[PDB]
Amino acid sequence: AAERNEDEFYFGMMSRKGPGSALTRGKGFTGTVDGDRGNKALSVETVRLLKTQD
RNA sequence: GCGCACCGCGCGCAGGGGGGCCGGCGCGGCAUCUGGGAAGACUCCUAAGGCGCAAGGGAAUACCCCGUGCGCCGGGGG
């Protein structure tokens, strides 16, 4: 954290959401980067399929 | 009709059959009036925007709140 480069660029930054700050995260601030549970916003046709099943 | 005063009524109670059919309650209609809901698509349809589903974040942690992907309607213009 001391010897980091402020103008650094990685291409995972275009596909990840950073740790933020206490002001952009607020009470839900830990110092970490969130990960993916594999959940997704599912479209309306396939939810119609899943609710005919239900 | 028994017990209580065999110098008395009435009383504690078992309950027959009908009565005053007095009022409440129950059920049935009730031309209207009253209230609520539904309601006509000219009407009302919450606004120039809203709604739904699925994910994401936060909690008064039963409720609720905020703005990503899919859709559904709408206003305006046309």
C-alpha–C-alpha distance, residues A31 and A23, integer Å = 12
Nucleotide nearest to A51 (CA to C1'): B53
Method: cryo-EM
3-state helix, strand, coil in chain A (%, to 5): 30, 0, 70
The answer to whether A33 touches A19, Cβ cutoff 8 Å, is yes
Q: Report the number of secondary-structure helices (H) and strands (E) in chain A.
A: 1, 0
Note the CA–C1' distance, A52 to B59, in angstroms: 34
Residue type, position A32, single letter: T
- How many whole angstroms separate alpha carbon A21 and alpha carbon A32? 10
Closest protein CA to C1' of nucleotide B52, residue: A44
The alpha carbon torsion through A7, A11, A12, A16 (nearest 10 deg) reads 80
- The three-state DSSP-derived secondary structure of A14-25 is HCCCCCCCCCCC
- Nucleotide nearest A30, from its CA to each C1': B57
